[PDB]
Design an enzyme around this catalytic site. Structure first.
Site, short mmCIF file in Angstrom:
data_model
loop_
_atom_site.label_atom_id
_atom_site.label_comp_id
_atom_site.label_asym_id
_atom_site.label_seq_id
_atom_site.Cartn_x
_atom_site.Cartn_y
_atom_site.Cartn_z
N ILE A 143 0.80 -1.24 0.00
CA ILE A 143 0.00 0.00 0.00
C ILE A 143 0.83 1.29 0.00
CG2 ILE A 143 -0.41 0.16 2.52
CD1 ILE A 143 -2.89 1.16 -0.17
N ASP A 144 1.91 1.34 0.75
CA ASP A 144 2.74 2.56 0.76
C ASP A 144 4.12 2.21 1.22
OD1 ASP A 144 2.42 2.24 3.49
OD2 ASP A 144 2.05 4.42 3.84
#
Lengths: 221, 51
Positions: A70-71
């Protein structure tokens, strides 16, 4: 030098270097980055601005699988998804256990998805504020959608780690792709320990007459 | 689940039937086609079509 390109933006890192394969999205990227980056550069980020876009140097034409987080790591992002060059982070250590058991490689010093043939590791969002996860979702938004669509024209298989993080991911994409959403390697009850996403990926490729992935090439000895 | 051993087993069987593809009855063909429907539903798209 030969496959590489550059484009100039108004905010750090000011110059974005990319592989030719990314050319069809760079125009929009420039545009979107110029509108957000001022707001976004106010915070200390992981990774640092100069490393935000280094994953655009990867070719896409040889890529069968996108392994997607996701990040970046809330501290110590190198600009390359999943990479811990000293082999410190749980996520990459836990992935290494999976791959250990699946290939019976007992002895090793580390693991990197970015050296593995035909895999492109990715982060949906390109930065976060130091120590805070998903802090920059609001800024990356339209860029993340743009970059991930591009990747899924080239890969057979998208493998996303985080059930919660990637529940509604199909809605982010226009055109379909083989999509698999597994557990984040730091998850309650060891659920990732029993996840067989790597064997599953390989079967799905074989069903697309694609060559399976050699997960073991990612070890570092 | 999308990620369990059971999934892996089902997909291994679908792979198995795709290779030979010389079915000998209604149940075998219905199995394969029901596997494909399952695969397309769970993983969105996959490489093989119903016969």
């Amino acid at each position: 030098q030969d496959p590489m390109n550059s484009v100039t933006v108004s905010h750090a890192p000011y110059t974005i270097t990319y592989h030719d394969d990314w050319e069809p999205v760079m125009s929009q990227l420039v545009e979107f980055y110029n509108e957000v980056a001022s707001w976004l550069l106010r915070d200390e980020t992981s990774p640092i601005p100069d490393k935000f876009f280094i994953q655009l140097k990867q070719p896409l034409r040889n890529k069968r699988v996108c392994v997607c987080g996701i990040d970046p790591y809330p501290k110590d992002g190198t600009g390359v998804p999943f990479e811990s060059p000293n082999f410190t982070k749980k996520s990459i250590k836990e992935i290494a256990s999976s791959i250990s058991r699946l290939t019976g490689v007992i002895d090793y010093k580390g693991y990197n998805l970015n050296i593995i043939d035909g895999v492109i590791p990715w982060n949906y969002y390109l930065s976060c504020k130091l120590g805070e996860t998903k802090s920059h979702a609001i800024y990356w938004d339209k860029i993340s959608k743009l970059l991930l669509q591009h990747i899924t024209k080239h890969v057979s298989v998208l493998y996303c780690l985080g059930k919660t993080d990637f529940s509604n991911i199909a809605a982010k994409l226009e055109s379909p792709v083989t999509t698999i959403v597994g557990y984040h390697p730091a998850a309650r009850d060891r659920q990732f320990e029993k996840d067989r996403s790597f064997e599953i990926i390989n079967v799905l490729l074989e069903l697309d007459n694609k060559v399976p992935i050699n997960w073991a090439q990612g070890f570092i000895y | 689940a999308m990620t369990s051993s059971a999934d892996l087993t089902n997909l291994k069987e679908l792979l198995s039937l795709y290779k030979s593809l010389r079915f000998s009855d209604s149940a075998a063909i219905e199995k394969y086609n029901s596997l494909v429907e399952w695969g397309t539903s769970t993983y969105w798209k996959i490489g093989v079509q119903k016969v």
